């Protein structure tokens, strides 16, 4: 994906590996010139999966799913049954522990497993 320009031809260059020298060279297709490459990088791409441009916000693409809710528990502050549960890690623990978030709009309480 990385493109360079010719020195005298001022055209595009193509990567050409020399089999007799075991090095990387950039050769101009129009003019007879073989420039020395640098850092052996011929491709670089930040992987972005946005292949549906100007169409991902119309239909629900679901690139950020919701957290599941359970009603077989009870909060500490309020006596509500509905609560949001998910899985994450602590600040210094090793593994994955279950967390809970209350669904009541006036409770504002969260607790671990």
């Amino acid at each position: 994906s990385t493109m360079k320009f010719c020195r005298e031809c001022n055209n595009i260059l193509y990567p050409k590996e020399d089999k007799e020298q075991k090095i990387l060279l950039y050769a101009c297709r129009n003019c007879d010139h073989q420039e020395v490459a640098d850092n052996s990088c011929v491709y670089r791409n930040e992987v972005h999966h946005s292949v549906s441009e100007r169409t991902q916000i119309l239909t629900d693409v679901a690139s950020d799913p919701t957290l599941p809710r359970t009603k077989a528990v009870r909060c500490s502050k309020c006596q509500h049954r509905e609560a949001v549960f998910f899985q994450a890690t602590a600040r210094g623990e090793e593994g994955m522990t279950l967390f809970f978030v209350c669904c009541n709009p006036n409770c504002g309480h969260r607790w671990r497993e």
Binding site: S1, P15, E17, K19, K22, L24, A37, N39, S40, C41, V42, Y43, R44, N45, E46, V47, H49, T59, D60, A62, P65, T66, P68, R69, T70, K71, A72, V73, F85, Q87, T89, M96, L98, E113
Partner: protein, 241 residues
């Protein structure tokens, strides 16, 4: 039929939201359900066993361990920077470098060797990639690669993909490796199976197929099988769980 048509005229012909539909369209899709084809959706609904309630918050842990096992997670959603580095028996001039941060592997409950094993499990079982006269494809996991291009992440791992050539230079072209080899392993899952779109956990009060004597259940959405195999017969092979 008159008692159903009278409920059909006196129904809301406007959708509630973009995810749900109108109560008229919901009655039309239920009544006209014998179309025996269409949209290749095939939505399933799995339940949980009775012995999972013997542990503290056993149902939530069981549903989360199911949704972590049978949900598709592609390799492109884990990587952050892909590159092709001219490394030079070497036997291959082009080596595909895939750099993965160490946070997304712990967030998705993965490791540096499990992604190599699952990449090999899709390379050795899917011949849908075009033939570049490839006899082998070894993947070497390395936590610190010597590619002096951009030292911007000192706490990430690297994945080197090397193609085995048959003592010639018929594979050493850059355009074919850039266009065929890179999107083949980037669209391969490292978690779950290929034919499952999305799995969500839902809570219900009056569920279909009731028990003997409110519960949590999962709703699995599978892709349309182009072959003769059914979606249920591919959902059954749920063989570890």
């Amino acid at each position: 039929a008159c008692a159903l048509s009278e409920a059909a005229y006196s129904a809301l012909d406007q959708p509630i939201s973009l995810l749900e539909t109108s109560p008229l369209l919901n009655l039309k899709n239920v009544l006209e359900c014998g179309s025996k084809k269409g949209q290749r959706e095939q939505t399933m609904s799995l339940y949980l066993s009775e012995y999972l309630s013997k542990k503290k918050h056993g149902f939530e842990y069981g549903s989360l361990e199911i949704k972590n096992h049978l949900e598709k997670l592609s390799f492109s959603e884990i990587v952050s920077t892909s590159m092709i580095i001219f490394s030079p028996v070497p036997l291959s001039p082009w080596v595909c470098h895939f750099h993965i941060s160490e946070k997304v592997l712990k967030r998705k409950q993965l490791s540096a060797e499990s992604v190599v094993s699952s990449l090999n499990e899709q390379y050795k079982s899917r011949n849908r990639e075009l033939k570049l006269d490839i006899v082998d494809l070894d993947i070497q996991n390395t936590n610190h690669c010597s590619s002096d291009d951009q030292a911007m992440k000192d706490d990430n791992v690297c994945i080197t993909v090397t193609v085995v050539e048959a003592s010639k230079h018929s594979v050493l072209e850059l355009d074919a490796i850039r266009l065929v080899l890179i999107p083949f392993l980037l669209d391969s899952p490292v978690k779950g199976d290929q034919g499952i779109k999305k799995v969500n956990i839902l809570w219900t009060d009056r569920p279909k197929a009731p028990k003997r004597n409110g519960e949590l259940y999962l709703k699995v959405t599978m892709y349309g099988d182009r072959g003769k195999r059914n979606c249920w017969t591919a959902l059954l092979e749920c063989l570890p769980i």
